[PDB]
Design a protein around this ligand. Structure first.
Ligand SMILES: Nc1ccc2c(c1)N(C(=O)C1CC1)CCC2
Ligand SMILES: [Cl-]
Length: 117
């Protein structure tokens, strides 16, 4: 990650861009598994396997609260979503497929955000 991403504090303008990125992910057709925390009814052992769960609604709350100080922190939460999914689910599962599509889309959007800063 470049120096700007690591430590240039997020400005209010940056935050408007982060909101747009997040909304783009939330609107993507393959984002359904990631919109809200994993339901333990859908995976009873999930919270014993995944020590730091993450989901787009938690990220939204954090964005609205101005939790993130640096772009790296936002990227780290987003990456947790995908890493948790690839670790918990087998590589042939629809969940894993959704993570590979959505992460690629996130990278496209993130590059656009970084260029716009
Ligand atoms: N939303 C939803 C529904 C069912 C399941 C998940 C999520 N899981 C996931 O790992 C998805 C988030 C990547 C756990 C296994 C089954
Ligand atoms: Cl939608």
């Amino acid at each position: 990650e470049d120096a700007m991403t690591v430590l240039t504090p997020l400005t209010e303008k940056d935050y408007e861009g982060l909101k747009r990125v997040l909304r783009s992910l939330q609107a993507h057709k393959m984002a359904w598994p990631f919109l809200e925390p994993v339901d333990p009814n859908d995976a009873p052992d999930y919270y014993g396997v995944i020590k730091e769960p993450m989901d787009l609604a938690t990220m939204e709350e954090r964005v609205q609260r101005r939790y993130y100080e640096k772009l790296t922190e936002f990227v780290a939460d987003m990456t947790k979503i995908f890493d948790n999914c690839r670790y918990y689910n087998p590589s042939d599962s629809p969940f894993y497929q959704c993570a590979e599509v959505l992460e690629s889309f996130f990278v496209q959007k993130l590059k656009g955000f970084k260029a716009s800063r």
